[PDB]
């Protein structure tokens, strides 16, 4: 009944900072560790994301890893940093320089040992571990390499536990460093095997959402990460509270896996509206559905209407009846029958938690798996084949001792993944 959090690489680290802030505000926890809430329901399931320490204090089941001290110092200097206990801030004093080979293969093992020790200790301090959730980058060095190594090791230690993760995928239009496709490929090759499922989010789509739909002109990392955190909180708000149905992760896992190998998902969150328009709208089930279905609200940089949906799960927050939401989903499945696969009747599954998010009377999160996402993997392959053809700056990675064979195998596996998505697509 307890889940352990893991954040690697500056991106995922501050993302989880925002996320823990969200959860703390949820359960009414002060930035000092004292409880200040209104309902016992904030406390009833506090175990899922906290342990208890004397003085009525609560510790997040948190572990922070990096290769640079300043990032950890920054997140510690931010609000709710004191809520963390310093016993978990594990880090080196040398960056990986965006080198998967450096982070995963050679330099990482040092911090890997200690962090794995901490994982063991914290897990066994709890009663019944449910699973793990990760937050890191796929184009950078640390959050990719050490993330992969650590998740592999944990899966070795716990063969049957729930392994889910959120990882940011690069986009051609926001690419930062040339080594992006290589890290992407290796991270993907490891995730597709050592993990049960994954979520894909891109700064491009986030930029679009905050820019247009929130009518914001100066989008900071804060709001993008804020939305990601809202999604992550939604995906488990069902578990954290009494509800009607489907509060569990493994439930969603077996619901969303039409085949073992195809476990990539795009998330979506609603309602999202700039404050200027919030005086107009009427938050109902049809409105929420029209928001979530629209490709303009997909956290992944892929227009689903080019592919067809395989599986869809929708979780709702607030006081709502069943009949409305189910007939709404039925109508949705009807009007857009082209974007669904006949393989499964009723491609949509639902879940309803009884607690609304603070500020909105109701809300909705959506998770989808459709072959359309395969196009983004082309964004890797081509770029990959664009550089690997010339062996462009391959020398950096050869130095750490990784062979061409590994890139070759990863590329072949990615090809296989694309081919299987195209198989099931028709």
């Amino acid at each position: 009944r307890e889940i352990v959090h893991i954040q690697a690489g500056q991106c995922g680290n501050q993302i989880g900072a925002k996320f823990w802030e969200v959860i703390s505000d949820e359960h009414g926890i002060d930035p000092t560790g004292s409880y200040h809430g209104d309902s016992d329901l904030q406390l009833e399931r506090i175990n899922v994301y906290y342990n208890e320490a004397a003085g009525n204090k609560y510790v997040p089941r948190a572990i922070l890893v990096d290769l640079e001290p300043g990032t950890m110092d920054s997140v510690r200097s931010g609000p709710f940093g004191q809520i963390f206990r310093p016993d978990n801030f594990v880090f080196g004093q040398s960056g990986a320089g965006n080198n998967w080979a450096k982070g995963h293969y050679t330099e990482g093992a040092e911090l890997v040992d200690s962090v794995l020790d901490v994982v063991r200790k914290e897990s066994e301090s709890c009663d019944c571990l449910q699973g793990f959730q990760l937050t890191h980058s796929l184009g950078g060095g640390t959050g990719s390499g050490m993330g992969t190594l650590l998740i592999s090791k944990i899966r070795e230690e716990y063969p049957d536990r729930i392994m889910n993760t959120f990882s940011v995928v690069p986009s051609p239009k926001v690419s930062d460093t040339v080594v992006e496709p290589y890290n992407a490929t290796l991270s993907v090759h490891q995730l597709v095997e050592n993990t049960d499922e994954t979520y894909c989010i891109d700064n491009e789509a986030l930029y679009d959402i905050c820019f247009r739909t929130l009518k914001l002109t100066t989008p900071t990392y804060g709001d993008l990460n804020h939305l990601v955190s809202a999604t992550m909180s939604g995906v488990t708000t069902c578990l954290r509270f009494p509800g009607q149905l489907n509060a569990d992760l493994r439930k969603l896992a077996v619901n969303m896996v039409p085949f073992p190998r195809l476990h990539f998902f795009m998330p979506g969150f609603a309602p999202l509206t700039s404050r200027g328009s919030q005086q107009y709208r009427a938050l109902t089930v049809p409105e929420l559905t029209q928001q979530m279905f629209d490709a303009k609200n997909m956290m992944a940089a892929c227009d689903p209407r080019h592919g067809r949906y395989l599986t869809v799960a929708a979780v709702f927050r607030g006081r709502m009846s069943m009949k409305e939401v189910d007939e709404q989903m039925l109508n949705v499945q009807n009007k857009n029958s082209s974007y669904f696969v006949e393989w499964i009747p009723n491609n949509v599954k639902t879940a309803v938690c009884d607690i609304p998010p603070r500020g909105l009377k109701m809300s909705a999160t959506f998770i989808g798996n459709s072959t359309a996402i395969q196009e983004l993997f082309k964004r890797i392959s081509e770029q990959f084949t664009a550089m690997f053809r010339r062996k462009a700056f391959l020398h950096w990675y050869t130095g750490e001792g990784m062979d061409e064979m590994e890139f070759t195998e990863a590329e072949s596996n990615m090809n296989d993944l694309v081919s299987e998505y195209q198989q099931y697509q028709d």
């Binding site: 019944c128 569990d248 439930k251 896992a253 069943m322 009949k323 039925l330 499964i344 009723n346």
Partner: protein, 428 residues
């Protein structure tokens, strides 16, 4: 002469809440457990308190402990609210085989204890689903065990059938079929109900726009009450569950009746009409009030039973029976000359505080074994077909220890069942 209550799966435990609220309100039992004032549902202590002969079981604690924190926490004994620590996650292998076999023992012991407390066990009721994980496999396992230990005792069940349109699990076909095998194997009389039909009924005849599970569950509780308290409380012509086995079973396999209730009327709709027995009896057979997404007119009828609550004179019952016999296109199979059973109780139906049904001076519940139900099966099978067409999701079950051979044999068994309904439907 006592009964046992079992609630497995989330729908089951919600049903339990509903029916127990209804009971305590039927007999002035304040939610504290006290009754400042009918002991087949409750065992009584010398303190003036009463305990319901019931058990609640599900592998995920949340709903159970919610019950433990609701109003009625003092009505139940902590020995009863048995819970696991990891749910079945919509997987027959997990609930039936992988996990539930680690809770089955304690609940079995509690059932056996409740039996020893009872003097004459007339039978028990079961409530669960065909779609959810916990309420699917674990239920099959428990039924298997009880059929080994007790046997001749009556085994009554209420399965919440997954609707063709409204659905909550990708594997609803799988769980449904795997449970269908076992309920053919060991159940006695199945009253499967669909959500959609209840939705239509309430949105049209009860006049609600936004039906919540509370309303459907209150309806189902009303149903089971009119079924059993009609005999536990005194009446005119008590017709026991054993007479149910006699009447509603034309053959050891044709034991799948459908349940219907009337009237379903709002407060305002209650006036602007005076309700005779004739009108309600006519209403009982319209498909718009049938609790299964199925067409009775299309199918043919084999057996029918009507139980009444309130003020009823047998002569008007005879009149209405003659009208129904002569008017409708109800094809009674020649293998039945007359399959009408009638039961009358004097206890008027009670209204739940804050409920959605107006108080009526007389009400009817109708049970009917008819071939039309076969329709529904085909749908699932066809749906199941497509899934088994690619063996999607099957990894999750072999990954938990099931055999595709079991899928095949289960499909063949369900095919045998529906084809047998077709055959016995064939007149000579």
């Amino acid at each position: 002469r006592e009964c046992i209550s079992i609630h497995v799966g989330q729908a089951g435990v919600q049903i339990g809440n509903a029916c127990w609220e209804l009971y305590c309100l039927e007999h002035g039992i304040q939610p504290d457990g006290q009754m400042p004032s009918f002991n087949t549902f409750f065992s009584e202590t010398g303190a003036g308190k009463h305990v319901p002969r019931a058990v609640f079981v599900d592998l995920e604690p949340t709903v159970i402990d919610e019950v433990r924190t609701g109003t009625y926490r003092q009505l139940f004994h902590p020995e009863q609210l048995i819970t696991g620590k990891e749910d079945a996650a919509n997987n027959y292998a997990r609930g039936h085989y992988t996990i539930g076999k680690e809770i089955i023992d304690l609940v079995l012991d509690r059932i056996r204890k409740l039996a020893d407390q009872c003097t004459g066990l007339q039978g028990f009721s079961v409530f669960h689903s065909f779609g959810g994980g916990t309420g699917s496999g674990f239920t099959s396992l428990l039924m298997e065990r009880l059929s080994v230990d007790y046997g001749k005792k009556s085994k009554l069940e209420f399965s919440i059938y997954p609707a063709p349109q409204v659905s909550t699990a990708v594997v609803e076909p799988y769980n449904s079929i795997l449970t269908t095998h076992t309920t053919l194997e060991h159940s006695d009389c199945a009253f499967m109900v669909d959500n959609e039909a209840i939705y239509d009924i309430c949105r049209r005849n009860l006049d609600i726009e936004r039906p919540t599970y509370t309303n459907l569950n209150r309806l189902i509780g009303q149903i089971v009450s009119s079924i059993t308290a009609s005999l536990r409380f005194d009446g005119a012509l008590n017709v026991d569950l054993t007479e149910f086995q006699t009447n509603l079973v034309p053959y050891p396999r044709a034991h799948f009746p459908l349940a219907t209730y009337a009237p379903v009327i709002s407060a305002e709709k209650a006036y602007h009409e005076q309700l005779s027995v004739a009108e309600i009896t006519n209403a009982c057979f319209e498909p718009a009030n049938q609790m299964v997404k199925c067409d009775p007119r299309h199918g043919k009828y084999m057996a029918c039973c009507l139980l009444y609550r309130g003020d009823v004179v047998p002569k008007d019952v005879n009149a209405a029976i003659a009208t129904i016999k002569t008017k409708r296109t109800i094809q009674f199979v020649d293998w039945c000359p007359t399959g009408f059973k009638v039961g009358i109780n004097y206890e008027p139906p009670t209204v739940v505080p804050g409920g959605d049904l107006a108080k009526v001076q007389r009400a009817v519940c109708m049970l009917s074994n008819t071939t039309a139900i076969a329709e529904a099966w085909a749908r699932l099978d066809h749906k199941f077909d497509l899934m088994y067409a690619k063996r999607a999701f099957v990894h999750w079950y072999v990954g938990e220890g099931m055999e595709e051979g079991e899928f095949s044999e289960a499909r063949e068994d369900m095919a045998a069942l529906e084809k047998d309904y077709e055959e016995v439907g064939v007149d000579s």
